[PDB]
Amino acid sequence: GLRKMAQPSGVVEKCIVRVCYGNMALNGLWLGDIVMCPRHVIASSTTSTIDYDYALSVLRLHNFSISSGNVFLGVVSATMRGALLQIKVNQNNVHTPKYTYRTVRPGESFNILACYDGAAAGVYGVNMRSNYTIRGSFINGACGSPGYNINNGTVEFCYLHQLELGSGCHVGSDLDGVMYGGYEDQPTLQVEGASSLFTENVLAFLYAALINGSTWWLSSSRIAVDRFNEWAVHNGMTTVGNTDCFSILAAKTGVDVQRLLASIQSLHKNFGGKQILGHTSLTDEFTTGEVVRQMYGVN
């Protein structure tokens, strides 16, 4: 079958801290002698816009209580960085991993370590949509939950949870403080943008179906990448790029991308009553990387 899986979370679990400001408490990311967390921890709002420049000016350092487990970290200073705060603390995180900052692109998958009260509670895999939103599972207290990817021994931090749109999907910022999709860290009316199926991920999915004996839906026809792309942009699907990354999957199925593109066009928003690996529509969830990794264990 095809599972959304998470990468092991241990390396990140020891970077999570509880950040309390007054009454408000959420999660922070604790690397070196700095704690990153969503800036709205110092604001108290329900229905109106927040003046963050003012909230920062009134901010009092002694109203912070930051803890890793039952170990409290003295707050030294705090500065604002986009939708985040840089909080300088008393000591270094000895368990600071080898890490980098990386901003996710649409279509790319990463891991979410769902945290509550400064403790990791659950871990699951997600995929960044063309929306620059994700379909996470978050409730009250989840803010500051980190998103990450582990790449050759290196932890790539890419997400800190900020926000749930009315549609139920979720938005975070990267570790530079930049809100994905230019959404705003306010409780204002913000409609989830239009999104397209990331076609490359759909291609990976259909390859996975061929590999698992699902071949009823295959078309005999073909379209060139260049002509599919001009159809895709007007039919709520993204354009297809280099296609080199589909060589391993093509070799394993003897099926080229062009023929899969043809299957997609006949399928898109017009499935029968049939399913494909238990899916009733084309899924955006899995990358070629994930599919190749899960079926053959190579990267």
């Binding site: 939950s145 926000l163 749930e164 749109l165 009315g166 975070g172 705003e184 306010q186 409780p187 204002t188």
Partner: peptide
């Protein structure tokens, strides 16, 4: 509306 978590 958007909901700050």
């Amino acid at each position: 509306x958007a909901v700050l978590x």
